[PDB]
Amino acid sequence: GMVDYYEVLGVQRHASPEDIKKAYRKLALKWHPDKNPENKEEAERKFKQVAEAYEVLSDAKKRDIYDKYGKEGLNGGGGGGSHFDSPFEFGFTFRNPDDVFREFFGGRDPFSFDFFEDPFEDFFGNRRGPRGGMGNFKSISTSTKMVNGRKITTKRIVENGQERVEVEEDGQLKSLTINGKEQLLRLDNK
């Protein structure tokens, strides 16, 4: 009948490889972890499914199998009674969906721009930019002590060459300094 991966892509069984590429790219954005983190439940599940769907469905070796079977799947060739040459299952494991998207996109929004959607030009940091960026951290020094029953924690965080000191008391930020310039926390109403 049809291959379930088509339903994952949201297309018809007669969709071309190029149309598979379309759905793949579109859904890569649509259900991207950073696109819809609010519904991470539906997003994660479908996002990962898209990885599998694309990789397998787009494989000519699997298409050969599907053509033999008639898109029947379970023992399709036997049920249909077909006689075509096809590749065999050799105990192949499942691939990390994240690695799939890493290969083809880099784990990033397919429809993003390096000149317009610059991660390092984002006040809020909703483009995988600095301020919590992986590989951007040089070194973090953490030291905690007890003062009059109070938990005093000081963190020296170096990121992108910039140093910021964070001093907390019982889990509450008391002082914050950036490159020797103390910032006023009263301005932070987030």
UniProtKB/Swiss-Prot annotation:
It is found in: Cytoplasm, Perinuclear region; Nucleus; Cytoplasm, Myofibril, Sarcomere, Z line. GO terms for molecular function: ATPase activator activity; DNA binding; heat shock protein binding; Hsp70 protein binding; identical protein binding; protein folding chaperone; protein-folding chaperone binding; unfolded protein binding. Widely expressed. Highest levels in testis and brain, and lower levels in heart, spleen, intestine, ovary, placenta, lung, kidney, pancreas, thymus, prostate, skeletal muscle, liver and leukocytes. In testis, expressed in germ cells in the earlier stages of differentiation pathway as well as in spermatids. In brain, expressed at a higher level in hippocampus and thalamus and a lower level in amygdala, substantia nigra, corpus callosum and caudate nucleus. Keywords: Chaperone, Cytoplasm, Disease variant, Limb-girdle muscular dystrophy, Methylation, Nucleus, Phosphoprotein. It comes from the Eukaryota. One of its GO terms (cellular component) is perinuclear region of cytoplasm. Residues 3-128 are annotated as: Interaction with HSP70. One of its GO terms (biological process) is syncytiotrophoblast cell differentiation involved in labyrinthine layer development. Residues 3-70 form the J domain. The keyword Mitochondrion does not apply. Has a stimulatory effect on the ATPase activity of HSP70 in a dose-dependent and time-dependent manner and hence acts as a co-chaperone of HSP70. Plays an indispensable role in the organization of KRT8/KRT18 filaments. Acts as an endogenous molecular chaperone for neuronal proteins including huntingtin. Suppresses aggregation and toxicity of polyglutamine-containing, aggregation-prone proteins. Also reduces cellular toxicity and caspase-3 activity. Homooligomer. Interacts with BAG3, HSPB8 and STUB1. Interacts with ALKBH1. Interacts with HSP70, KRT18 and PTTG. It is linked to Muscular dystrophy, limb-girdle, autosomal dominant 1: An autosomal dominant myopathy characterized by adult onset of proximal muscle weakness, beginning in the hip girdle region and later progressing to the shoulder girdle region. This is DnaJ homolog subfamily B member 6. It comes from Homo sapiens (Human). The lineage of its organism: Eukaryota, Metazoa, Chordata, Craniata, Vertebrata. The chain holds residues 1 to 230 of 326 of the full protein.
